[PDB]
Every structure is written in structure tokens, then in C-alpha cells.
Curated annotation (Swiss-Prot):
Residues of the full protein shown: 106 to 384 of 384
Annotated organism of origin: Parengyodontium album (Tritirachium album)
Keywords noted in UniProt: Calcium, Disulfide bond, Hydrolase, Metal-binding, Protease, Serine protease, Signal, Zymogen
Catalytic residues of the enzyme: D39 (charge relay system), H69 (charge relay system), S224 (charge relay system)
Lineage, highest ranks first: Eukaryota, Fungi, Dikarya, Ascomycota, Pezizomycotina
Name this polypeptide is given: Proteinase K
Disulphide connectivity of cysteines: C34-C123, C178-C249
Phosphoprotein as UniProt keyword: no
GO molecular-function term, one example from the UniProt record: serine-type endopeptidase activity
Cofactor note text: Binds 2 calcium ions per subunit.
Record-listed E.C. numbers: 3.4.21.64
Superkingdom per UniProt: Eukaryota
Amino acid sequence: AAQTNAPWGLARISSTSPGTSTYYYDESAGQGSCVYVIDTGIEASHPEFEGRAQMVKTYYYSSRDGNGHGTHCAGTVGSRTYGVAKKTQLFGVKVLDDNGSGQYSTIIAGMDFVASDKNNRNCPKGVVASLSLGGGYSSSVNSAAARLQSSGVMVAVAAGNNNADARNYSPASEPSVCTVGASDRYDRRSSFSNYGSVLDIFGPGTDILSTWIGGSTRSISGTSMATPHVAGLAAYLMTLGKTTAASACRYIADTANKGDLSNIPFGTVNLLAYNNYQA
């Protein structure tokens, strides 16, 4: 399948070179997989989700995305026009308030919730979790992400936007989950993207067009935007049977575009998420 005039990020993950405009992908599109978007919520009503998005848990007086961040992230995972895995099931877990903030105790609870709730869901091709969030180093937050991964979920987390070593941020610094840095459309490291040995992979993160609340769209930037590219790619690959939750991060690193990015500091991987689709 091919999507003409796709957002640059989608074209990027189906090409070996930057600058193209078509997203090439296998028509299975992540059908039968599930991605939990652990964020500010999802506007499940948005036409771009086509009925495939639903809230399953909230930690605040409402389950609505009153911010947009989580809807944008969910859109990059699986919306029809802006999403990597266009037939995946999307589940919303609102651990962040409508200012985009949340306590670590709430984020940990949301992660433990997903580890259990996936046993309530029909996800025959496997389960992914996308965490476009983080703060300073916490052993407890890192452990929560490691438990979620251990329970059989492919965990993808943002490296952070501090232009610093992600070793000092959580859950970015957890070794057993997939930590995602951000690149721009010219294959440069995004100016804000964290870096360091704990990163596993880069994804498109600068000027990413996706869904927004109120049934709209917008382009924003962040490692928050790169993480759902990798999460959706994992769900796409698990539907294709090419990997599993336990191995997807390594498989994506195995099959990434290598050495294509500029301004990668010494000791940080030079790997860019890539679907290696051959029509």
C-alpha cells in the first residue's frame, strides 16, 4: 500500500533517504495489534481514528483529552492519515492532566494498569505501550516501565527534550525498554532531543503533523512525537509476525537506517526507525 502526500515522518520510516513524500507500507497496517497511549487522553471521537480508539482508564475527574498532546501522539501511532499502523487498536490511559503534567505515582499506576488490562483485551498480534512523558531520574518509574515490558508489552518511551544525556531522566534511562530520540526532516538530531547510551533508536520528531483535539490537526515537535512512530512501527511489525513484544526494540534497531543522522554525539546510536517494506 502507498499513502501519497504523507507527513514527512511517515515517508521517512518507509525510505532509506530523507525528502520523499510517500509512505509505503504493508496493507495489514497493524490489524490485530493494540497500542496503549499513556498520555493526556485520546479524542476517540476524532474521525481520523475511525472507531478504533477508546479510552480505557483515567486518573482525573475526566477521561477527555483537554490538552491535545495524547491525541497527537495517538494519531501518529494509528490515525488513518497521520498514523504508522493504520488498522491498530488504540487504548487511551490518561495519566497526564490537561496541562500535560502528572505525578510519578500516577504514571506508575497507569503502567501497572496496562500490564493487567491487556488481559481484558483481544490483541492477538500483541500489545505495545507508547509513553511520551518523563521527568528526572526515578528508580521506581524505571521499575514500572521494566515491569510493563516484562509482562509482555513492547514499551517505547521518549528520551526527553533537554538536549542532555537521557541517563538522568525516567523512564528514558530504563535499560529494558525502547528509548526514542528525535530527528528532523533533514536527518539532523532534533535540537532539543536528549541523547546518550540509553537511547535505542531515533524517530521523526521535529514538525510532526498529526491529530489534535476538536477534530483538528497540527504540527508540533518533541521526542514525544518520535516515540509513537516507533510504537506504531512495532505494532506494524508484530502484526506482520516479524517480531514480538520482547524483541521488537532490538529488531527495530537491527533493521534501522544506520549512520544517516547528523549531530549524533559520541556514544549515542546512529539508528533511524525503518520499516524495510518491499512492494
